[PDB]
Amino acid sequence: MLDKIELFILDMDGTFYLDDSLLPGSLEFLETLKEKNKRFVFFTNNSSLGAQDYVRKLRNMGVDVPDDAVVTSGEITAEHMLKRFGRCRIFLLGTPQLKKVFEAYGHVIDEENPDFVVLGFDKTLTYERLKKACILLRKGKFYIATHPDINCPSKEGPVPDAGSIMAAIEASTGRKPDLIAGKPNPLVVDVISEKFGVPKERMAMVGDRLYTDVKLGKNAGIVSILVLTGETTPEDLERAETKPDFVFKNLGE
Numbered sequence: 001m002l003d004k005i006e007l008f009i010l011d012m013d014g015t016f017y018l019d020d021s022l023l024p025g026s027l028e029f030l031e032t033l034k035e036k037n038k039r040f041v042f043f044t045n046n047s048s049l050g051a052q053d054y055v056r057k058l059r060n061m062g063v064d065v066p067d068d069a070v071v072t073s074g075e076i077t078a079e080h081m082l083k084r085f086g087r088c089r090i091f092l093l094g095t096p097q098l099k100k101v102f103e104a105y106g107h108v109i110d111e112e113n114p115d116f117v118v119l120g121f122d123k124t125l126t127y128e129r130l131k132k133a134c135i136l137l138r139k140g141k142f143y144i145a146t147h148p149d150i151n152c153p154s155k156e157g158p159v160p161d162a163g164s165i166m167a168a169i170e171a172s173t174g175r176k177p178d179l180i181a182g183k184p185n186p187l188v189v190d191v192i193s194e195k196f197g198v199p200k201e202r203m204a205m206v207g208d209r210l211y212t213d214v215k216l217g218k219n220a221g222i223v224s225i226l227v228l229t230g231e232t233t234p235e236d237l238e239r240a241e242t243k244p245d246f247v248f249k250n251l252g253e
């Protein structure tokens with residue numbers, strides 16, 4: 001029951017900040033982890049940008065932080081492919097930033113003859129790119145998606161995300177991803193574990209997504225810490241450990 005934890009995977013929008021503005025207590029929270037000798041790693045299923053893009057956004061916000069401090073379903077999806085397939089020739093349904101991410105992992109984008117069709121939060125999607133992906137899929141190419149999320153919360157409200165695009169791809173090719181690396185797929189915790197050394201026995205998930213964040217911890221087997229700075233109140237199914245924001249979080253060590 002807490003206090004014996006070493007690594008805290010933190011959510012970003014909805015948990016650490018909101019609407020591009022830090023959330024009260026967030027700053028003071030990290031500091032508390034410093035003192036109490038704790039390790040923290042941010043994570044987001046949003047693959048429309050790469051880790052660095054976020055590291056910038058955080059610092060530009062007022063948070064000095066290392067480069068390995070952020071992780072995305074992007075780098076997870078890449079690293080996992082390299083792990084079990086190696087340098088791959090993929091048709092990427094993603095954004096320029098997501099691409100650079102896959103390239104840094106030695107992968108290559110071959111619009112011509114690819115082995116995998118990879119789908120990310122493609123904010124640069126076009127009908128043609130969809131048409132191509134669908135055809136390649138009907139040629140039975142390995143199909144991988146960075147995350148499952150249907151919509152993504154925004155200033156203007158819920159907006160189409162990877163899941164929404166998937167919906168179309170599936171209605172057309174009748175096919176669904178062969179793999180999805182993002183939460184709640186345990187893979188995230190496993191990879192984060194390896195990359196930092198600390199074991200699942202001393203790791204905690206801190207977020208605001210009642211279903212996803214809680215269910216991640218269940219599948220990956222680690223304490224899930226639900227925070228109430230996001231859209232949370234309705235509850236059933238699985239539960240976890242709870243607190244309003246990081247004020248409470250911090251004070252609870």
Ligand SMILES: CC(=O)N[C@@H]1[C@@H](O)[C@H](O)[C@@H](CO)O[C@@H]1O
Nearest residue numbers: 228231232233234235236237239
């Ligand atoms: C009874 C139950 O387990 N669920 C409720 C949920 O419906 C309600 O909206 C919320 C208020 O924040 O409290 C609980 O989570």
